[PDB]
Tab-separated table of N, CA, C and O in Angstrom:
chain	number	residue	atom	x	y	z
A	1	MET	N	-19.280	15.065	26.363
A	1	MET	CA	-18.783	13.819	25.719
A	1	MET	C	-18.204	14.103	24.323
A	1	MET	O	-18.561	15.090	23.685
A	2	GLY	N	-17.300	13.238	23.856
A	2	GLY	CA	-16.614	13.478	22.583
A	2	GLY	C	-17.283	12.819	21.375
A	2	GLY	O	-17.904	13.494	20.550
A	3	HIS	N	-17.123	11.500	21.254
A	3	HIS	CA	-17.671	10.724	20.123
A	3	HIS	C	-17.086	11.162	18.762
A	3	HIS	O	-17.642	10.839	17.711
A	4	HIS	N	-15.957	11.874	18.778
A	4	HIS	CA	-15.321	12.332	17.531
A	4	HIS	C	-13.793	12.469	17.672
A	4	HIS	O	-13.285	12.951	18.683
A	5	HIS	N	-13.071	12.021	16.649
A	5	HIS	CA	-11.604	12.099	16.628
A	5	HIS	C	-11.069	12.334	15.208
A	5	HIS	O	-11.725	12.012	14.216
A	6	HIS	N	-9.870	12.897	15.116
A	6	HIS	CA	-9.187	13.038	13.829
A	6	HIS	C	-8.198	11.878	13.630
A	6	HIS	O	-7.154	11.823	14.278
A	7	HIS	N	-8.551	10.945	12.743
A	7	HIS	CA	-7.766	9.718	12.541
A	7	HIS	C	-6.287	10.015	12.229
A	7	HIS	O	-5.928	10.350	11.099
A	8	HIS	N	-5.439	9.908	13.253
A	8	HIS	CA	-3.992	10.099	13.095
A	8	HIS	C	-3.237	8.758	13.125
A	8	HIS	O	-2.111	8.667	12.642
A	9	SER	N	-3.854	7.726	13.703
A	9	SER	CA	-3.223	6.399	13.806
A	9	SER	C	-2.815	5.850	12.430
A	9	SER	O	-3.559	5.965	11.454
A	10	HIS	N	-1.628	5.246	12.365
A	10	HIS	CA	-1.067	4.759	11.095
A	10	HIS	C	-0.905	3.226	11.058
A	10	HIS	O	-0.159	2.651	11.852
A	11	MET	N	-1.607	2.580	10.128
A	11	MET	CA	-1.375	1.162	9.811
A	11	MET	C	-0.024	0.978	9.096
A	11	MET	O	0.444	1.888	8.411
A	12	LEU	N	0.606	-0.190	9.249
A	12	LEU	CA	1.879	-0.453	8.563
A	12	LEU	C	1.823	-1.722	7.686
A	12	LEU	O	1.153	-1.737	6.655
A	13	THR	N	2.509	-2.790	8.106
A	13	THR	CA	2.742	-3.956	7.233
A	13	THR	C	3.332	-5.141	8.024
A	13	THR	O	3.338	-5.118	9.256
A	14	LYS	N	3.810	-6.175	7.316
A	14	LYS	CA	4.408	-7.364	7.947
A	14	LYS	C	5.407	-6.975	9.049
A	14	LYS	O	5.457	-7.595	10.113
A	15	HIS	N	6.216	-5.955	8.775
A	15	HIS	CA	7.159	-5.422	9.760
A	15	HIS	C	6.824	-3.948	10.069
A	15	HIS	O	6.102	-3.297	9.314
A	16	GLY	N	7.347	-3.418	11.171
A	16	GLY	CA	7.088	-2.018	11.522
A	16	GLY	C	7.934	-1.031	10.716
A	16	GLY	O	8.626	-0.180	11.280
A	17	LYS	N	7.860	-1.134	9.389
A	17	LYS	CA	8.668	-0.304	8.485
A	17	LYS	C	7.810	0.589	7.568
A	17	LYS	O	8.357	1.397	6.816
A	18	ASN	N	6.481	0.449	7.639
A	18	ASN	CA	5.568	1.123	6.694
A	18	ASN	C	5.757	0.552	5.268
A	18	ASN	O	6.839	0.663	4.693
A	19	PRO	N	4.695	-0.042	4.674
A	19	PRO	CA	4.789	-0.806	3.408
A	19	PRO	C	5.599	-0.097	2.313
A	19	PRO	O	6.365	-0.732	1.588
A	20	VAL	N	5.435	1.216	2.200
A	20	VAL	CA	6.165	1.996	1.198
A	20	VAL	C	7.683	1.934	1.442
A	20	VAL	O	8.441	1.469	0.594
A	21	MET	N	8.116	2.376	2.621
A	21	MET	CA	9.548	2.389	2.960
A	21	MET	C	10.119	0.961	3.061
A	21	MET	O	11.275	0.725	2.711
A	22	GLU	N	9.301	0.024	3.542
A	22	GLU	CA	9.682	-1.397	3.604
A	22	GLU	C	9.980	-1.952	2.205
A	22	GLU	O	11.043	-2.526	1.964
A	23	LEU	N	9.036	-1.767	1.287
A	23	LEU	CA	9.189	-2.223	-0.096
A	23	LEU	C	10.440	-1.610	-0.753
A	23	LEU	O	11.129	-2.268	-1.533
A	24	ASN	N	10.739	-0.353	-0.412
A	24	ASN	CA	11.937	0.339	-0.918
A	24	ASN	C	13.236	-0.205	-0.290
A	24	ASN	O	14.337	0.127	-0.739
A	25	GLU	N	13.115	-1.011	0.764
A	25	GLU	CA	14.273	-1.722	1.322
A	25	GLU	C	14.356	-3.138	0.740
A	25	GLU	O	15.444	-3.647	0.466
A	26	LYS	N	13.196	-3.767	0.544
A	26	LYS	CA	13.133	-5.118	-0.023
A	26	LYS	C	13.551	-5.117	-1.506
A	26	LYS	O	14.166	-6.070	-1.995
A	27	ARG	N	13.202	-4.042	-2.212
A	27	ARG	CA	13.586	-3.856	-3.620
A	27	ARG	C	14.018	-2.404	-3.895
A	27	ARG	O	13.601	-1.473	-3.204
A	28	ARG	N	14.855	-2.224	-4.913
A	28	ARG	CA	15.282	-0.893	-5.359
A	28	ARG	C	14.851	-0.633	-6.812
A	28	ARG	O	14.518	-1.563	-7.549
A	29	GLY	N	14.862	0.638	-7.216
A	29	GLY	CA	14.410	1.004	-8.556
A	29	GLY	C	12.907	0.826	-8.732
A	29	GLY	O	12.452	0.138	-9.650
A	30	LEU	N	12.132	1.448	-7.846
A	30	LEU	CA	10.673	1.305	-7.854
A	30	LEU	C	9.990	2.543	-8.453
A	30	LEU	O	10.612	3.592	-8.626
A	31	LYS	N	8.705	2.417	-8.765
A	31	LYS	CA	7.921	3.539	-9.303
A	31	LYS	C	6.602	3.707	-8.534
A	31	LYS	O	5.858	2.746	-8.372
A	32	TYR	N	6.324	4.927	-8.069
A	32	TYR	CA	5.045	5.247	-7.411
A	32	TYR	C	4.339	6.406	-8.132
A	32	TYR	O	4.733	7.564	-7.987
A	33	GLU	N	3.303	6.098	-8.909
A	33	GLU	CA	2.549	7.137	-9.632
A	33	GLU	C	1.053	7.092	-9.294
A	33	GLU	O	0.560	6.133	-8.700
A	34	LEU	N	0.341	8.140	-9.688
A	34	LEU	CA	-1.093	8.260	-9.415
A	34	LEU	C	-1.929	7.752	-10.598
A	34	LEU	O	-1.685	8.124	-11.748
A	35	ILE	N	-2.916	6.911	-10.304
A	35	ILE	CA	-3.824	6.378	-11.324
A	35	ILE	C	-5.207	7.054	-11.244
A	35	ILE	O	-5.705	7.598	-12.232
A	36	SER	N	-5.818	7.031	-10.059
A	36	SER	CA	-7.138	7.655	-9.846
A	36	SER	C	-7.114	8.597	-8.638
A	36	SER	O	-6.414	8.346	-7.657
A	37	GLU	N	-7.884	9.678	-8.715
A	37	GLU	CA	-7.906	10.695	-7.657
A	37	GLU	C	-9.247	11.439	-7.618
A	37	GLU	O	-9.656	12.049	-8.609
A	38	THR	N	-9.930	11.381	-6.474
A	38	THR	CA	-11.215	12.080	-6.296
A	38	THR	C	-11.546	12.314	-4.817
A	38	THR	O	-11.025	11.630	-3.927
A	39	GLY	N	-12.427	13.281	-4.565
A	39	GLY	CA	-12.848	13.598	-3.206
A	39	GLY	C	-14.324	13.969	-3.123
A	39	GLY	O	-14.761	14.951	-3.728
A	40	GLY	N	-15.095	13.185	-2.374
A	40	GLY	CA	-16.531	13.419	-2.265
A	40	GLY	C	-16.923	14.264	-1.056
A	40	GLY	O	-16.087	14.951	-0.463
A	41	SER	N	-18.199	14.199	-0.689
A	41	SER	CA	-18.744	15.000	0.419
A	41	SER	C	-18.088	14.667	1.768
A	41	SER	O	-17.810	15.562	2.566
A	42	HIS	N	-17.854	13.383	2.027
A	42	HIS	CA	-17.281	12.949	3.312
A	42	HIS	C	-16.161	11.907	3.138
A	42	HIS	O	-15.447	11.592	4.090
A	43	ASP	N	-16.013	11.372	1.928
A	43	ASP	CA	-15.059	10.283	1.676
A	43	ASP	C	-14.087	10.621	0.529
A	43	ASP	O	-14.412	11.392	-0.375
A	44	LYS	N	-12.889	10.039	0.585
A	44	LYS	CA	-11.874	10.211	-0.463
A	44	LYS	C	-11.603	8.881	-1.179
A	44	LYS	O	-11.833	7.807	-0.619
A	45	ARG	N	-11.103	8.943	-2.413
A	45	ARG	CA	-10.802	7.716	-3.160
A	45	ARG	C	-9.626	7.907	-4.133
A	45	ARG	O	-9.785	8.435	-5.237
A	46	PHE	N	-8.443	7.480	-3.698
A	46	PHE	CA	-7.215	7.587	-4.494
A	46	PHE	C	-6.664	6.195	-4.841
A	46	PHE	O	-6.768	5.262	-4.045
A	47	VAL	N	-6.072	6.066	-6.027
A	47	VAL	CA	-5.461	4.802	-6.469
A	47	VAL	C	-4.045	5.041	-7.016
A	47	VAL	O	-3.866	5.802	-7.968
A	48	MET	N	-3.048	4.389	-6.417
A	48	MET	CA	-1.644	4.549	-6.833
A	48	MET	C	-1.086	3.242	-7.428
A	48	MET	O	-1.529	2.148	-7.070
A	49	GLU	N	-0.115	3.365	-8.335
A	49	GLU	CA	0.519	2.197	-8.968
A	49	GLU	C	2.002	2.088	-8.577
A	49	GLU	O	2.742	3.076	-8.630
A	50	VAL	N	2.430	0.885	-8.189
A	50	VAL	CA	3.827	0.641	-7.820
A	50	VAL	C	4.487	-0.401	-8.741
A	50	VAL	O	3.910	-1.449	-9.034
A	51	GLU	N	5.696	-0.093	-9.206
A	51	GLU	CA	6.476	-1.018	-10.039
A	51	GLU	C	7.552	-1.740	-9.213
A	51	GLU	O	8.524	-1.124	-8.769
A	52	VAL	N	7.369	-3.040	-9.004
A	52	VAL	CA	8.345	-3.866	-8.283
A	52	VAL	C	8.826	-5.031	-9.163
A	52	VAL	O	8.017	-5.827	-9.645
A	53	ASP	N	10.142	-5.118	-9.381
A	53	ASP	CA	10.723	-6.151	-10.253
A	53	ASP	C	10.156	-6.062	-11.685
A	53	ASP	O	10.156	-7.042	-12.431
A	54	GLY	N	9.682	-4.874	-12.063
A	54	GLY	CA	9.073	-4.685	-13.376
A	54	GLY	C	7.560	-4.900	-13.376
A	54	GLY	O	6.874	-4.556	-14.341
A	55	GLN	N	7.038	-5.456	-12.285
A	55	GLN	CA	5.607	-5.761	-12.164
A	55	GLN	C	4.844	-4.593	-11.523
A	55	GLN	O	5.293	-4.023	-10.531
A	56	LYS	N	3.688	-4.239	-12.086
A	56	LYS	CA	2.897	-3.109	-11.580
A	56	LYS	C	1.685	-3.575	-10.757
A	56	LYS	O	0.858	-4.361	-11.227
A	57	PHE	N	1.597	-3.086	-9.522
A	57	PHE	CA	0.462	-3.374	-8.637
A	57	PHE	C	-0.246	-2.071	-8.226
A	57	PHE	O	0.407	-1.086	-7.885
A	58	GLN	N	-1.578	-2.067	-8.255
A	58	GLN	CA	-2.354	-0.865	-7.909
A	58	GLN	C	-3.133	-1.032	-6.594
A	58	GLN	O	-3.745	-2.074	-6.341
A	59	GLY	N	-3.123	0.016	-5.773
A	59	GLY	CA	-3.842	0.000	-4.498
A	59	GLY	C	-4.671	1.262	-4.270
A	59	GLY	O	-4.314	2.341	-4.748
A	60	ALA	N	-5.771	1.133	-3.528
A	60	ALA	CA	-6.686	2.257	-3.296
A	60	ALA	C	-6.764	2.648	-1.810
A	60	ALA	O	-6.883	1.789	-0.937
A	61	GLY	N	-6.704	3.953	-1.538
A	61	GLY	CA	-6.804	4.461	-0.170
A	61	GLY	C	-7.460	5.841	-0.100
A	61	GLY	O	-7.792	6.429	-1.129
A	62	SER	N	-7.637	6.366	1.114
A	62	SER	CA	-8.297	7.676	1.313
A	62	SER	C	-7.392	8.866	0.940
A	62	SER	O	-7.788	10.021	1.087
A	63	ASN	N	-6.179	8.585	0.477
A	63	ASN	CA	-5.265	9.625	-0.026
A	63	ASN	C	-4.088	8.991	-0.783
A	63	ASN	O	-3.909	7.773	-0.735
A	64	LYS	N	-3.291	9.816	-1.475
A	64	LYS	CA	-2.149	9.321	-2.269
A	64	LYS	C	-1.261	8.365	-1.457
A	64	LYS	O	-1.012	7.229	-1.855
A	65	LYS	N	-0.802	8.843	-0.307
A	65	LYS	CA	0.187	8.125	0.507
A	65	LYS	C	-0.377	6.825	1.111
A	65	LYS	O	0.319	5.807	1.169
A	66	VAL	N	-1.634	6.854	1.551
A	66	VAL	CA	-2.310	5.637	2.024
A	66	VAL	C	-2.555	4.653	0.865
A	66	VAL	O	-2.436	3.437	1.030
A	67	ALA	N	-2.878	5.186	-0.312
A	67	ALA	CA	-3.048	4.357	-1.510
A	67	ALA	C	-1.716	3.703	-1.916
A	67	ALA	O	-1.684	2.547	-2.336
A	68	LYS	N	-0.618	4.454	-1.776
A	68	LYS	CA	0.732	3.913	-1.981
A	68	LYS	C	0.996	2.739	-1.028
A	68	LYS	O	1.599	1.737	-1.412
A	69	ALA	N	0.541	2.880	0.218
A	69	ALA	CA	0.688	1.824	1.225
A	69	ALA	C	0.018	0.516	0.773
A	69	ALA	O	0.636	-0.551	0.808
A	70	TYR	N	-1.244	0.603	0.347
A	70	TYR	CA	-1.977	-0.577	-0.135
A	70	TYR	C	-1.380	-1.130	-1.438
A	70	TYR	O	-1.315	-2.346	-1.631
A	71	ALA	N	-0.947	-0.236	-2.326
A	71	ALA	CA	-0.268	-0.638	-3.563
A	71	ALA	C	1.005	-1.439	-3.249
A	71	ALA	O	1.275	-2.476	-3.860
A	72	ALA	N	1.776	-0.951	-2.278
A	72	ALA	CA	2.989	-1.638	-1.827
A	72	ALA	C	2.657	-3.007	-1.217
A	72	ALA	O	3.266	-4.020	-1.570
A	73	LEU	N	1.681	-3.031	-0.306
A	73	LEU	CA	1.217	-4.283	0.310
A	73	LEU	C	0.728	-5.287	-0.742
A	73	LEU	O	0.907	-6.495	-0.586
A	74	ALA	N	0.117	-4.783	-1.813
A	74	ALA	CA	-0.320	-5.635	-2.923
A	74	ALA	C	0.863	-6.412	-3.521
A	74	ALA	O	0.740	-7.589	-3.871
A	75	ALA	N	2.010	-5.743	-3.623
A	75	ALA	CA	3.243	-6.373	-4.110
A	75	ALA	C	3.884	-7.267	-3.034
A	75	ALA	O	4.313	-8.385	-3.316
A	76	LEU	N	3.939	-6.764	-1.802
A	76	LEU	CA	4.557	-7.482	-0.679
A	76	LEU	C	3.897	-8.854	-0.434
A	76	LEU	O	4.581	-9.873	-0.353
A	77	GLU	N	2.566	-8.875	-0.340
A	77	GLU	CA	1.817	-10.127	-0.124
A	77	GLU	C	2.006	-11.131	-1.281
A	77	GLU	O	1.748	-12.329	-1.128
A	78	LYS	N	2.447	-10.637	-2.435
A	78	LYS	CA	2.645	-11.481	-3.623
A	78	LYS	C	4.111	-11.947	-3.748
A	78	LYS	O	4.384	-13.118	-4.020
A	79	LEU	N	5.049	-11.027	-3.535
A	79	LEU	CA	6.481	-11.307	-3.728
A	79	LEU	C	7.177	-11.769	-2.432
A	79	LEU	O	8.023	-12.665	-2.463
A	80	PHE	N	6.816	-11.174	-1.292
A	80	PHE	CA	7.499	-11.464	-0.014
A	80	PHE	C	6.518	-11.866	1.118
A	80	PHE	O	6.586	-11.313	2.218
A	81	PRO	N	5.616	-12.849	0.895
A	81	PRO	CA	4.650	-13.266	1.928
A	81	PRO	C	5.297	-14.098	3.050
A	81	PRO	O	4.753	-14.193	4.151
A	82	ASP	N	6.459	-14.700	2.754
A	82	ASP	CA	7.198	-15.528	3.723
A	82	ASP	C	6.374	-16.766	4.157
A	82	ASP	O	6.693	-17.435	5.140
A	83	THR	N	5.328	-17.073	3.393
A	83	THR	CA	4.422	-18.190	3.708
A	83	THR	C	4.969	-19.540	3.211
A	83	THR	O	5.796	-19.585	2.297
A	84	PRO	N	4.513	-20.664	3.815
A	84	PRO	CA	4.909	-22.025	3.388
A	84	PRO	C	4.459	-22.376	1.953
A	84	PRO	O	4.107	-21.495	1.161
A	85	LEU	N	4.474	-23.676	1.632
A	85	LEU	CA	4.080	-24.172	0.302
A	85	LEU	C	2.711	-23.625	-0.151
A	85	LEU	O	1.854	-23.288	0.670
A	86	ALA	N	2.514	-23.549	-1.464
A	86	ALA	CA	1.292	-22.971	-2.036
A	86	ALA	C	0.307	-24.047	-2.520
A	86	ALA	O	0.577	-24.773	-3.477
A	87	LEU	N	-0.840	-24.144	-1.851
A	87	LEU	CA	-1.920	-25.036	-2.290
A	87	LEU	C	-2.894	-24.281	-3.207
A	87	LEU	O	-3.578	-24.876	-4.047
A	88	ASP	N	-2.942	-22.960	-3.042
A	88	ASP	CA	-3.822	-22.104	-3.838
A	88	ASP	C	-3.100	-20.816	-4.270
A	88	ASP	O	-2.613	-20.052	-3.432
A	89	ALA	N	-3.035	-20.582	-5.580
A	89	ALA	CA	-2.379	-19.389	-6.126
A	89	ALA	C	-2.864	-19.082	-7.553
A	89	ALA	O	-2.941	-19.973	-8.402
A	90	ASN	N	-3.190	-17.816	-7.815
A	90	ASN	CA	-3.627	-17.392	-9.151
A	90	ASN	C	-2.444	-16.864	-9.975
A	90	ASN	O	-2.141	-17.381	-11.053
A	91	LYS	N	-1.788	-15.822	-9.465
A	91	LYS	CA	-0.595	-15.245	-10.107
A	91	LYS	C	0.472	-14.882	-9.055
A	91	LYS	O	0.297	-13.863	-8.342
């Protein structure tokens, strides 16, 4: 029996474009830099920052590129949610 796999499956975003490449189509002149980076006994913890429309959003993932994905989604869900009227919103 197996009970073990190497996680190769890739999460994306609102569309099948991958949040990073998608955001780079939705907006141009973006910035992707590293904020936090560490690796423990069995788990990883990376945090990347993305600049969209001058606004900086930070996301955390198990590596740089996955952290970029969450950072991008952080901007996408805020700038391009495509949702109806807003009854609840902070920023």
